[PDB]
Amino acid sequence: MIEADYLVIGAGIAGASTGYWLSAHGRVVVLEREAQPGYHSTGRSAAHYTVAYGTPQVRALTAASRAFFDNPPAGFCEHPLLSPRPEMVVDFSDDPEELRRQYESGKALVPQMRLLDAEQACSIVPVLRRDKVFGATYDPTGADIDTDALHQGYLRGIRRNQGQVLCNHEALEIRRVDGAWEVRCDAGSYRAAVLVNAAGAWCDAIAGLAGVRPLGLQPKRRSAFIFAPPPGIDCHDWPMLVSLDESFFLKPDAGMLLGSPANADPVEAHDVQPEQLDIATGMYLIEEATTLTIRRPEHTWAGLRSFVADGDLVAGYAANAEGFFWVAAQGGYGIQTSAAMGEASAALIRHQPLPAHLREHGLDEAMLSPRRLSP
């Protein structure tokens, strides 16, 4: 039996970021089912940072994370966590009212957002089919995230603060015993006053083991693939390209191109595989919008983006289940919100107010709380 101050289930970006901030204040033990910590959604993302994306709460958490990403503590990482990658959202269907709505809402949050005409969009990504382009928004502040450096920075930080990150430690039974949570794994048992449920698509499964009413979390499959660009064109500086209805996205990645149909097909929590239909649809949509020819993709995969009803993230104690803390519903935003989520969740776990720099971005405890959800 191992005793901790904070017992975290899940070592993805959610558990790693929360554990990182908690580890300055007490003993953190993170239990991870897989042999490695980033095998599920945290290892499967498009690795992009976009402020004007998601609900208002998501946008606030994303904006509030930028300070840490651009200036992490000494020793956190060897190289920058972000690299410049503007986002261009292109209207391919002739919907000027929607284009203007997105421009105005994005510009209110990102003053440098621009409205482009068709020629300006085609200048930036020359493979766009000019006949299909009706304008675009352009966000000069988008960035690519070095997700492995970020994730490993969080995990190493836990260990440097005398915490533990224990892989091959699936939580199998969870019980509140004598004022603390006790978790049984095949490889040992663990006890702590606080159980941090950071289990990704499995958060409601963890609540089920504990007898705690679940959130209603819905995992949703998104597939993606990498393909070769034509050898005679330099796409390495292209922005992240998205269609106005998020029917697809396309971004450069290590001399290749990363594409996706940006799907959200509801599925159960599992080790999700790409569906051939997902890949075919993404290929079709990119070829409809651009002059690219996509041969058989070099690599395809899928991951889970998990949401509650309102599309917002969840960080808070469960009502009437003392010490059970949700860090859940990261949706399509878990990487880009992770610094603010980790800092906010650690403060709330410790029953402290949210730090000033988070409240100034317009975050409060209530809009993170799970109590907002079910009747």
Ligand SMILES: Cc1cc2c(cc1C)N(C(=O)/C=C/CNC(=N)N)c1c([nH]c(=O)[nH]c1=O)N2C[C@H](O)[C@H](O)[C@H](O)COP(=O)(O)OP(=O)(O)OC[C@H]1O[C@@H](n2cnc3c(N)ncnc32)[C@H](O)[C@@H]1O
């Ligand atoms: C698939 C995917 C996902 C994303 C994306 C793409 C694709 C293709 N991107 C986008 O399309 C962006 C579109 C932009 N579009 C417009 N601009 N217009 C994206 C992104 N996000 C982000 O910011 N930027 C991105 O660019 N996403 C989302 C992030 O992928 C996601 O939100 C976080 O990764 C979630 O992280 P979590 O930490 O919640 O989840 P987890 O990594 O699965 O970890 C849980 C751990 O619990 C363990 N576990 C379970 N049960 C137990 C147990 N019993 N015992 C012990 N351990 C247990 C489990 O084994 C696992 O290890």
